[PDB]
Design a protein around this ligand. Sequence first.
Ligand SMILES: Nc1nc2c(c(=O)[nH]1)N[C@@H](/C(S)=C(/S)[C@H](O)COP(=O)(O)OP(=O)(O)OC[C@H]1O[C@@H](n3cnc4c(=O)[nH]c(N)nc43)[C@H](O)[C@@H]1O)C=N2
Ligand SMILES: Nc1nc2c(c(=O)[nH]1)N[C@H]1C(S)=C(S)[C@@H](COP(=O)(O)OP(=O)(O)OC[C@H]3O[C@@H](n4cnc5c(=O)[nH]c(N)nc54)[C@H](O)[C@@H]3O)O[C@H]1N2
Ligand code: SF4
Ligand code: SF4
Ligand code: SF4
Ligand code: SF4
Ligand code: F3S
Ligand SMILES: [Mo]
Ligand code: NA
Lengths: 329, 895
Amino acid sequence: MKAPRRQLTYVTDLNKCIGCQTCTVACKKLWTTGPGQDFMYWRNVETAPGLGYPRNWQTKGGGYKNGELQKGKIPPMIDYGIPFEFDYAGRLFEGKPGRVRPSPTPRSAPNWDEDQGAGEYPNNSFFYLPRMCNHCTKPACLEACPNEAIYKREQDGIVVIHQDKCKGAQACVQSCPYAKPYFNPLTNKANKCIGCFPRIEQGVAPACVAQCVGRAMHVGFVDDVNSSVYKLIKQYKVALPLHPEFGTEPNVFYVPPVLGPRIEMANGEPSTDPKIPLAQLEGLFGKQVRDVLAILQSEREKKMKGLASDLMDVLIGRRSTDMMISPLT
Amino acid sequence: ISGAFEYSGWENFHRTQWSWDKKTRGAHLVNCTGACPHFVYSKDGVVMREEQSKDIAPMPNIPEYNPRGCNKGECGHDYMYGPHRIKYPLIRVGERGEGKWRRATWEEALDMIADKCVDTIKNHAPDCISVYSPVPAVSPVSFSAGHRFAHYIGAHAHTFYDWYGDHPTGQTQTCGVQGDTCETADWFNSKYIILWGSNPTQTRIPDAHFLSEAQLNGAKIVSISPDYNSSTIKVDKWIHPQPGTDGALAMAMAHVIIKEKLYDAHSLKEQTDLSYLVRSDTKRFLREADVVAGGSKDKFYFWNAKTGKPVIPKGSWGDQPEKKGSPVGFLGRNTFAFPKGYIDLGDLDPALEGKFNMQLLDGKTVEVRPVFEILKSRLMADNTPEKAAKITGVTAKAITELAREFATAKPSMIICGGGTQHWYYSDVLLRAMHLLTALTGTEGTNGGGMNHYIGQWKPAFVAGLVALAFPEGVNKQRFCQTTIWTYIHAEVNDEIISSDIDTEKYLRDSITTGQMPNMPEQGRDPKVFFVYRGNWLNQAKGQKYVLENLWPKLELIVDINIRMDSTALYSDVVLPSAHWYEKLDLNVTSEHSYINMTEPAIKPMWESKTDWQIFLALAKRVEMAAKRKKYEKFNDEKFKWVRDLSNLWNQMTMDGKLAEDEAAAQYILDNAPQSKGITIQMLREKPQRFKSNWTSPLKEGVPYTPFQYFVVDKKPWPTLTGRQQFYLDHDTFFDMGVELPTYKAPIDADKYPFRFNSPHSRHSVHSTFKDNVLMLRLQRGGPSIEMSPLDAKPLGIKDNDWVEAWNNHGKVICRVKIRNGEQRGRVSMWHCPELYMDLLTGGSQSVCPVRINPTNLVGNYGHLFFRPNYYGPAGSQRDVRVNVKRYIGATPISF
Ligand SMILES: Nc1nc2c(c(=O)[nH]1)N[C@@H](/C(S)=C(/S)[C@H](O)COP(=O)(O)OP(=O)(O)OC[C@H]1O[C@@H](n3cnc4c(=O)[nH]c(N)nc43)[C@H](O)[C@@H]1O)C=N2
Ligand SMILES: Nc1nc2c(c(=O)[nH]1)N[C@H]1C(S)=C(S)[C@@H](COP(=O)(O)OP(=O)(O)OC[C@H]3O[C@@H](n4cnc5c(=O)[nH]c(N)nc54)[C@H](O)[C@@H]3O)O[C@H]1N2
Ligand code: SF4
Ligand code: SF4
Ligand code: SF4
Ligand code: SF4
Ligand code: F3S
Ligand SMILES: [Mo]
Ligand code: NA
């Protein structure tokens, strides 16, 4: 497919994500308001640990195994969640008795297990994991498509499903190990995150970055040595891709959570271990996590002693334009 | 060639999705405290979406406020076009609540209302009419419309700050102020923050970044919450006490700090009443009238350790300023009229410890002790960490370590919220918090203090609001106190046996001695009720008493709304109000120091009108009705006010000057020192910072933190003592055992096993957005009540089962979410889902009575007097207890 001239690159600071879903709502009200897209959350935020969206997506299959394209499953509709529908008119305006129940009977939804996580009180633990298309350097969706409908933009490395060229083969759905293409059953086309390329083209950050309320999102071109994404991925090396073992070389990276309280022992007193287990983070981000957390902890400790820490200042992001392409629009 | 890449032409499909022809300023006029600047994008006269405008000016060295926003705000336009929208005036044809309506013209609807209003004045009394519209800061012009209408016809207004439980009762008792708090950017100036009954990850969404940013910048944060709440996953330490036992925790921290001498003695001596001398015989403050002929009942003594003589402290209630100023609504009295340096400690050295003898007026010698000496002895006796650990379930070691850390880090701050403010005894708990803050001496310092956050209660330009809403003066306006009004007119059963707390006697005596109001006067029923900008019925405590007992007394109930909420569903007339993006209004909050606003992106949809225009239209039809009924002028003896209903519209608009919404908003800005000089056009372009604030200076580039006029400029606090007053030597406080801060165990009058928590959810703004389809799709399609697995499993309750919760007040049936982070012995139902949502019966308020704490009824003790939203009974509800069982009429299988 050939490398892009520049690669739009995201960093998600899990020390700062508050799981408010504003980014989920922003993307949906901008790009996925059309026919057949009601169940599609190009941007979504899942509680970790949990089932995610679609449920059990992390064992769906796809990606590459020793360089070989894998064909995973196509998630059934119930794993995404049948989008609930409601009859407000009847009850509120038309004199109909009966509560305004959701249809269907609730059993699954994109955020079903919010704030449940794992562990028993007083060592329950969870955090938030925002997700979107990773605009991979090795896009499994792109290789899979038998109609070459998916392309990777030369100017910014954004991966896009060409809606005219798509014929509904759903190989992309099978092969993306992140489950981020969604098959639209009304139009018979896959739809997915477009990296907000219309905003990028006008020098405006994507909506899930510019509208991030927690101030946890970074974006830029990784070749820009003065960008926060460069500083976090390349210089300080505290931003890791999600599930590198899928072999797609994502271009969305995560700063793991070093904030958080200690495990509480039976006598009510703290352990040195965090409530967020390292084993969970290693499951998400691989064996480099330990070393990243150490860097982060060490740099935060400098700040606690009144000393300087350029890395902490990058994550703090006192000015949004030090974290991202201009968010103003 | 154009330079375009291979697929650039097809990509125009997506480029067209992000396009608009018009961009206007918008705001969400809801009680969220966000006051978040937004742009609204329209195309071909249709609003397409909104996005944070991200244009609050930054302050040096600290994170900017931008972008703010939240998940409700970025789908706010759903209420323009959704299935909930009121399009036309509606009149009930069925029973209240059925949703059977007939469409009516504005003329018929307003005439019906006008006819009933005149009749009610003529046949009964003007105070049989009332208008409930809360939180003026959210939308001050819209607020002022109904209040100005009530102002001129003699109808009474309501309170909201206390009725909601948000009023920091303990702060008004301690400080003599309505309330005040730092803006949230000041959190970044703290080294050590206690989040105490506050869940800002969910309930301060646009401001929560300052907390994680402060931590990455070296601050430590503690969360105190029984459940492992979403905010707690980021903090450095989690303290999880039993519900409502936080006072025991605070008093034991105070013990450790006093005993280990970690406090700021200079601050205590100067800024608090803790050196003031207390008679050992009567337990009251030694007063000048005890010692001297014609001496003041409102002047006191401390013992000056430098001279060995008693000295009268300056600035107390009996000490007048030489230059009296006008009253200020948020102060017990205008102590700003005193000169700078007035209460500076000079070379005084008030003793905090010791016993002393003094000679009264009738010769006899009395032992006096400083307040601090009394406090210290009681704390050593009763408030050890070991004793508090038994009550709270927090280890003594953890209590001690927290106390030491909080007193050692400088600056340290407490951030409190509904989890600590919505309890029967929250007043004495916040006094205890203020005691912790005074001991560490961080009040009035950046990054310090006791900072409360709740709703959108604070309009800095309050004088301009009062000018528009109550132009003839607040002293010429009827107010009820809504907690009392609801308790009495709904005939609530609070289940508190009078031999424990004689609530009835305190309340009746409060009213007959004029300390607290009762409306209507002479025992008349309320008859006409206007509700707008608040879902009064859905959110009301004691709701089952209200529906059964109060609602049927009302002959006419009018709801003005953008949507059919539950109150409107139970109303007689429903009038369509213009959406936030179809109107002009201001929008401000205590969390940041900038003025927000909304303006029309498009004209009001369907037949809707802005709230200002509705009450102007009603004014005209009231003139006409008064003429038909030959009742145009009448004497209102309470105010020596001959009202003229024939000129109501000119009264509403100042002879037409304020007939346009924008002029009403500009009138507010012009009539407050905090805003005079700001114009609507400026605010249309960019949010503007206030020019001044309330109890501190507002300095360029520096976050506001309150009370510096007392802490730094040494003006007296507006309390009886003239200090932060921890001794309240009033009979009712002695009766309740809280003359000093101490632990008061929660009310257990509900004889049922689970404590009922009703916290606020990230997925709605109160009842608004509860029914939003997108929000529900991001949950489980309806309301939720949370339970620990250790309680659910013995009851056979599975995740997402229906559960029934009940007590003597009512019952609710709601789907459960089992969450390991919930603490056994309590259930947590996100507050006030709409009654028409996915509930099989009732709602969160069915199980809540109205309860009145007698200390909140005191109105004759210096700075404790009734003034609307300044002091009054809190509508607490966290003491509620319920039982829970699986509902077995529907048990769906999971897959
Ligand atoms: N058990 C328990 N009980 C509790 C609490 C608890 O924690 N536990 N919390 C309290 C607290 S603290 C609060 S602040 C109340 O819930 C606030 O309720 P409120 O009716 O003001 O907001 P809501 O959003 O529900 O209603 C706002 C109404 O105003 C409509 N609206 C919004 N904007 C406008 C407007 O511009 N004009 C007009 N005429 N109407 C507008 C809105 O549709 C809704 O009906 C209360 N009780
Ligand atoms: N998204 C959103 N944000 C909001 C609102 C909204 O409706 N939606 N409402 C706004 C307004 S008006 C309000 S008043 C505030 C309220 O919001 P908050 O001030 O955060 O208050 P709560 O949500 O009631 O409780 C906060 C946490 O305190 C815990 N808690 C309960 N009881 C206790 C106790 O006894 N001791 C301690 N230490 N903790 C306890 C609760 O479980 C919860 O985890 O939110 C405001 N922010
Ligand atoms: S995340 Fe999936 S859809 Fe996006 S580029 Fe990588 S493989 Fe393709
Ligand atoms: S980049 Fe744009 S399209 Fe992709 S998730 Fe974020 S908002 Fe949605
Ligand atoms: S908007 Fe920002 S903080 Fe809120 S959920 Fe998305 S990433 Fe996390
Ligand atoms: S609803 Fe409140 S918090 Fe959410 S964006 Fe609007 S103003 Fe801000
Ligand atoms: S495989 Fe290709 S044809 Fe469409 S559904 Fe996926 S892009
Ligand atoms: Mo509130
Ligand atoms: Na129905």
